[PDB]
Amino acid sequence: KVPPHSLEAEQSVIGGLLLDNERWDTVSEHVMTQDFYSRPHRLIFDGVKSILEAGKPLDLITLSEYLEQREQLEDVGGFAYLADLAKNTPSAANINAYAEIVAERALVRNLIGVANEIADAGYDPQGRNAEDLLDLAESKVFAIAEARTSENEGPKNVDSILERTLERIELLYKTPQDGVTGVNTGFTDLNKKTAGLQGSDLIIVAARPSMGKTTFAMNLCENAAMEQDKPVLIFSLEMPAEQIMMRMLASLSRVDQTKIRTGQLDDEDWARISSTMGILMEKKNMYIDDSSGLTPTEVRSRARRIAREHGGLSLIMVDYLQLMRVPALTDNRTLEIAEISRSLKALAKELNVPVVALSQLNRSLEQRADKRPVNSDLRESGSIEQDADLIMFIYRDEVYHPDSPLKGTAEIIIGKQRNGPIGSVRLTFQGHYSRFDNYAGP
Amino acid sequence: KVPPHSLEAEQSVIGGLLLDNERWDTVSEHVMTQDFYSRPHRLIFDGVKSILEAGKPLDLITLSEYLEQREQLEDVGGFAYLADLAKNTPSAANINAYAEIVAERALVRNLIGVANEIADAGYDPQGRNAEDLLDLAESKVFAIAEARTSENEGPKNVDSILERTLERIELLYKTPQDGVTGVNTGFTDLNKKTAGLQGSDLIIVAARPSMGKTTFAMNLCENAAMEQDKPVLIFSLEMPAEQIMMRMLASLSRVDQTKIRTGQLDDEDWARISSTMGILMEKKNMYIDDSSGLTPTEVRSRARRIAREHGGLSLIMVDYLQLMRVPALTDNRTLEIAEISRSLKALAKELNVPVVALSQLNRSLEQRADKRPVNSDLRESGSIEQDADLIMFIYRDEVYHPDSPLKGTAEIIIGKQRNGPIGSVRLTFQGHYSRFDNYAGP
DNA sequence: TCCAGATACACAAAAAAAAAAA
Numbered sequence: 001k002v003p004p005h006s007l008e009a010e011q012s013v014i015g016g017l018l019l020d021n022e023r024w025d026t027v028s029e030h031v032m033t034q035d036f037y038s039r040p041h042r043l044i045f046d047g048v049k050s051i052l053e054a055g056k057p058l059d060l061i062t063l064s065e066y067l068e069q070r071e072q073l074e075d076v077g078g079f080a081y082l083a084d085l086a087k088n089t090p091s092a093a094n095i096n097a098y099a100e101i102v103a104e105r106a107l108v109r110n111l112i113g114v115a116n117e118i119a120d121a122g123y124d125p126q127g128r129n130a131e132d133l134l135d136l137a138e139s140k141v142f143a144i145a146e147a148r149t150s151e152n153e154g155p156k157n158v159d160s161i162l163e164r165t166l167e168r169i170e171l172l173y174k175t176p177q178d179g180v181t182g183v184n185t186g187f188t189d190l191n192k193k194t195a196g197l198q199g200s201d202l203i204i205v206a207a208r209p210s211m212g213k214t215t216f217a218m219n220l221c222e223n224a225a226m227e228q229d230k231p232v233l234i235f236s237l238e239m240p241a242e243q244i245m246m247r248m249l250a251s252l253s254r255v256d257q258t259k260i261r262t263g264q265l266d267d268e269d270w271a272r273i274s275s276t277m278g279i280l281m282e283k284k285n286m287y288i289d290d291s292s293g294l295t296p297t298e299v300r301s302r303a304r305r306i307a308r309e310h311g312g313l314s315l316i317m318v319d320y321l322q323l324m325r326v327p328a329l330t331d332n333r334t335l336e337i338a339e340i341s342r343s344l345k346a347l348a349k350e351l352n353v354p355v356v357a358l359s360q361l362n363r364s365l366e367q368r369a370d371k372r373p374v375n376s377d378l379r380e381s382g383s384i385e386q387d388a389d390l391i392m393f394i395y396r397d398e399v400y401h402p403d404s405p406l407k408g409t410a411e412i413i414i415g416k417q418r419n420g421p422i423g424s425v426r427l428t429f430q431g432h433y434s435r436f437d438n439y440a441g442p
Numbered sequence: 443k444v445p446p447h448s449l450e451a452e453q454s455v456i457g458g459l460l461l462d463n464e465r466w467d468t469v470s471e472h473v474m475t476q477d478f479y480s481r482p483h484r485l486i487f488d489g490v491k492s493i494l495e496a497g498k499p500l501d502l503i504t505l506s507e508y509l510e511q512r513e514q515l516e517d518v519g520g521f522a523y524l525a526d527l528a529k530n531t532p533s534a535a536n537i538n539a540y541a542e543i544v545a546e547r548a549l550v551r552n553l554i555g556v557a558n559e560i561a562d563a564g565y566d567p568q569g570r571n572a573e574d575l576l577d578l579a580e581s582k583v584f585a586i587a588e589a590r591t592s593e594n595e596g597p598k599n600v601d602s603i604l605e606r607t608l609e610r611i612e613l614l615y616k617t618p619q620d621g622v623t624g625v626n627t628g629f630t631d632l633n634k635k636t637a638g639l640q641g642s643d644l645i646i647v648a649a650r651p652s653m654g655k656t657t658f659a660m661n662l663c664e665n666a667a668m669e670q671d672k673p674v675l676i677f678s679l680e681m682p683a684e685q686i687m688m689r690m691l692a693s694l695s696r697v698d699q700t701k702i703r704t705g706q707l708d709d710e711d712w713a714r715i716s717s718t719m720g721i722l723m724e725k726k727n728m729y730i731d732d733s734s735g736l737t738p739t740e741v742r743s744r745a746r747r748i749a750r751e752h753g754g755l756s757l758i759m760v761d762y763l764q765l766m767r768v769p770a771l772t773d774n775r776t777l778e779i780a781e782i783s784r785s786l787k788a789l790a791k792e793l794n795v796p797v798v799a800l801s802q803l804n805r806s807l808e809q810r811a812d813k814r815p816v817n818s819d820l821r822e823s824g825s826i827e828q829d830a831d832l833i834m835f836i837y838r839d840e841v842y843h844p845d846s847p848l849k850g851t852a853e854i855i856i857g858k859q860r861n862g863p864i865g866s867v868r869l870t871f872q873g874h875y876s877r878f879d880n881y882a883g884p
Numbered sequence: 885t886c887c888a889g890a891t892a893c894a895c896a897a898a899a900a901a902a903a904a905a906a
């Protein structure tokens with residue numbers, strides 16, 4: 001059988017070395033003298049490496065002269081073969097890939113050789129017992145695997161990591177940026193715990209029906225759009241853009257939502273609406289997608305298109321993740337939810353922007369004495385919680401207990417945070433404006 | 443009869459990608475792997491997609507070594523075909539102009555394949571009737587259309603949404619309608635707290651057996667048909683049309699239902715019935731369907747036919763949504779109910795008409811000291827409570843406590859309203875006339 | 885693999901009773 005090898009890869013490596021000299025540093029750290037297969041190729045590579053290490057400039061003429069000095073010019077095919085190799089070079093940009101291919105082929109060939117060597121033993125014990133045969137397998141495989149080393153995926157001593165951490169904390173002494181390092185939510189208490197909405201993270205807001213989930217997410221997105229510079233993308237798979245716009249106008253302009261919807265407004269309400277209209281038309285930092293049944297690929301494509309068009313994004317909202325469709329798994333729901341969650345996390349990591357994805361809760365919450373949500377109430381949510389960087393629930397006590405002393409107030413439960421504290425935050429809820437607010441009072 | 447294809451477009455796309463890899467972002471959004479016709483081109487495009495999706499450089503050597511690793515370089519024609527493909531492409535100036543050609547050719551080929559398949563199925567009925575063949579053809583054509591119905595959809599900015607919202611608000615403001623902008627329900631407090639039954643919404647009425655769901659729904663439908671000009675469509679999956687007609691006659695004529703059903707009637711009752719018949723024949727805005735076991739597609743088709751024949755509809759009634767069935771999801775009841783609710787919501791959104799979906803309640807209510815229904819008591823109802831826009835419960839206290847001070851009275855609880863307040867409304871219930879009415883006392 | 889409906893045993897226990905404390 002033909003051993004695995006790529007002569008074209010070796011020719012490309014030689015051509016790239018001849019044509020380009022500034023990239024020798026990267027090539028020198030990936031290939032050796034014994035990695036090449038063809039003997040004339042080995043001689044040519046040895047000569048080129050010797051010339052390059054000698055410090056002399058590399059060119060076809062000097063390479064031919066050096067080969068003639070050792071009388072190996074005719075052995076490697078002559079000057080014509082070298083000229084053909086130089087002419088057949090595709091480009092010098094991808095010499096690293098060629099070197100990696102050559103190294104991989106050498107590794108697999110040596111592994112096959114070691115396998116044949118161990119296989120030969122056993123057909124001729126030569127006095128060795130089973131224990132000796134077992135022992136002289138691990139040593140050979142470890143020898144053939146030790147040549148490759150992870151870079152830099154290796155254990156590190158405390159000195160380097162401690163020095164890097166000291167450097168990090170020394171530069172962070174200046175410019176505190178008032179605590180928040182990501183996207184300002186607008187609520188001081190939640191800013192203290194979450195330290196803003198960090199990028200490359202997945203944030204999940206979940207609650208029972210009619211709790212204030214879409215309102216909370218829209219408030220966060222509106223504050224981000226008002227403060228930040230890059231646009232904020234919203235995927236409204238539940239409601240049309242008209243209703244979201246009416247809610248935003250009611251929230252910003254301090255105008256009753258019902259009067260806006262029914263068209264019963266006085267002069268002051270119109271003045272407030274005109275002011276917020278002027279502000280919104282001056283900003284131009286909001287995008288709404290009202291399409292239904294979007295697949296993860298479509299969401300990714302549209303997000304990438306917007307990001308490339310405007311150079312970046314600030315925040316992405318999905319409402320909600322259970323309404324997305326994966327046609328390849330229409331016969332299974334749990335796997336579909338897992339794929340949706342993994343795709344959302346991958347998109348968040350790729351675009352380096354936070355993604356606020358909403359979710360629903362199971363009906364087991366209301367069949368218990370205590371109605372406070374937990375992490376198990378999310379529907380089909382092994383993956384929903386496994387790959388979530390922050391889970392925030394919404395709980396209003398006045399819904400279940402009409403006589404509760406916490407009327408006109410809501411609690412945000414941080415059920416999970418990888419690098420932050422957890423707890424509860426109390427916020428004032430004003431439904432007629434579709435707005436949350438800081439708790440000025442007790 | 444050669445199926446449509448264009449090898450030149452595929453070769454141009456592959457050559458443009460090989461020459462410059464920086465335009466893969468635009469190309470990946472237009473042409474996929476399966477759009478190609480020739481199998482070697484499909485394999486080479488799979489290899490190109492695999493190489494470029496990870497960001498690694500793509501060239502002749504990389505693609506050739508990737509194809510050779512899986513014994514697939516012989517099928518595509520070897521390195522010679524790849525070299526010819528790379529050489530034959532002058533430049534990638536209009537690379538985006540060939541992906542559309544490939545996509546449209548693939549779409550035409552799929553359409554003609556489906557057209558041949560339907561004819562072949564028609565030539566071999568295999569025991570299927572013509573109705574089944576027509577249904578299959580319609581389903582396949584709809585599935586084809588849904589994939590590429592339009593391309594103008596996408597993330598829109600805030601300017602167009604603001605302009606449309608301002609136009610709608612001004613239109614509503616300039617035409618006062620006594621505070622109700624939707625279909626009047628006939629009850630003053632309910633209209634005040636609901637502003638009518640707004641269009642493009644899903645409304646659910648739920649109560650325990652023998653509480654008044656059908657009576658309340660029929661009262662709403664009668665009032666809507668009496669005031670509106672467009673007709674009202676009623677789906678009666680439970681009771682025959684004769685019983686509903688008798689109940690409606692009793693409600694409108696103010697005549698005992700038992701006397702009408704049995705036949706012992708006086709002269710004043712006959713006079714009132716004659717007046718009601720005259721009014722009904724004068725208006726004639728009612729359509730009653732009494733078929734059982736209807737799939738969502740059948741009700742959608744009937745509603746479309748009625749709306750097309752009469753140029754619009756004002757109200758659609760389903761009683762009740764647990765009687766509808768999807769034959770493809772018989773093995774799971776929860777998914778079937780979710781599909782029914784989703785289909786009802788989609789129909790309401792499409793036709794721009796309020797839809798009343800009567801629902802039952804679970805038996806977990808009877809185990810509580812408080813018999814007032816909650817949103818979680820609906821049967822098999824994740825989507826029922828997560829998709830509705832207005833939930834109205836019916837609760838009569840005299841059924842549980844015979845000597846209540848609220849005898850001859852009923853309470854309606856608005857358990858959920860996405861864009862409105864929640865509360866309760868007290869109404870007078872007259873069983874012998876099978877109708878609700880306004881309440882004047884405290 | 886989750887969601888939803890329903891019969892039955894067991895945990896006390898929960899309050900209420902209530903005895904009785906006052």
Ligand SMILES: Nc1ncnc2c1ncn2[C@@H]1O[C@H](COP(=O)(O)OP(=O)(O)OP(O)(O)=S)[C@@H](O)[C@H]1O
Pocket residue numbers: 208209210211212213214215216238257258431432433434827828829858859860861862863864
């Ligand atoms: N004018 C108003 N006055 C008082 N409460 C209101 C008013 N308008 C809306 N609300 C309430 O505000 C809340 C809004 O709920 P949302 O957060 O928008 O919906 P949701 O939480 O996403 O739940 P879904 O999507 O319907 S399952 C509801 O509880 C409404 O009853």
Ligand SMILES: Nc1ncnc2c1ncn2[C@@H]1O[C@H](COP(=O)(O)OP(=O)(O)OP(O)(O)=S)[C@@H](O)[C@H]1O
Pocket residue numbers: 650651652653654655656657680699700802873874875876
């Ligand atoms: N002549 C009458 N006198 C007194 N009560 C009456 C009379 N006729 C009807 N009723 C009551 O009015 C109710 C009518 O409500 P219905 O519409 O039958 O309830 P329902 O929701 O349809 O029950 P379902 O369909 O089985 S879930 C009856 O169940 C009786 O309780």
Ligand SMILES: [Mg+2]
Pocket residue numbers: 213214238319
């Ligand atoms: Mg919502």
Ligand SMILES: [Mg+2]
Pocket residue numbers: 655656680761
């Ligand atoms: Mg009924």
